[PDB]
Copies of this chain bind each other. A is one copy, B any other.
Amino acid sequence: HMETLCQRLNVCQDKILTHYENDSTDLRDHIDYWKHMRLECAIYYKAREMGFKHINHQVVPTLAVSKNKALQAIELQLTLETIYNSQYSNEKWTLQDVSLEVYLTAPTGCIKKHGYTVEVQFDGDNTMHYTNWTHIYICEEASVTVVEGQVDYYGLYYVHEGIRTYFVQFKDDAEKYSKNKVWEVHAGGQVILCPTSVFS
């Protein structure tokens, strides 16, 4: 075991680093990376179950940490596999496109690409920065549809199957930071001003 776990982790961790070095744009390679990310969790989970506090002088996480990371790896592996079976399969996909960091940025649980900043001024440049995305992949059990990140006076949203879904509502930050609920949105084009009447 000791040896067996060490050798398995070493092989697993070498594959992960090789993916990092190569920086491929082929979706197939990203699938294999996330499968290795998932396998690493199974190795640490077993090491922890066996009572090891380190493997090769590297900390072995608690079981709950390894379970949670394997769930994250699974979500990414599955998503990429659904994309692999769709019409979007042959696009360019970068490692950062398929990273957990992107995946969890609003809108959470979605691979996304071609991100850019939208800035909201809550009175004169409290000024917040938010990421919008031209390509948002909505993956379900047997399908995927790419939608575009759109920008409102009210926030950032997409429209999927007819349904407009806001993933950022600018009023949330305004009520947390500012005194007035009136702002100006800059997103790479005409500033967006409040479209309704403003009062006393």
List A residues at the B interface (Cβ < 8 Å). Answer: 35, 38-39, 41-42, 44-46, 49, 66-71, 74, 78, 81-82, 85-86, 140-143
Contacts and interface: CB of A to CB of B under 8 A. Distances in A.
* Total copies of the chain: 2
A39 B141 CA distance: 10
Contact of A67 (B66, B67, B141): B141
A142 B42 contact: yes
Contacts of A45: 142-143
A142 B46 CA distance: 8
A85 B78 CA distance: 17
Contacts of A39: 85
Contact of A142 (B66, B82, B140): B66
Contacts of A71: 141
A81 B147 CA distance: 31
Contacts of A74: 78, 141
A33 B48 CA distance: 33
B85 A142 contact: no
Contacts of A35: 81
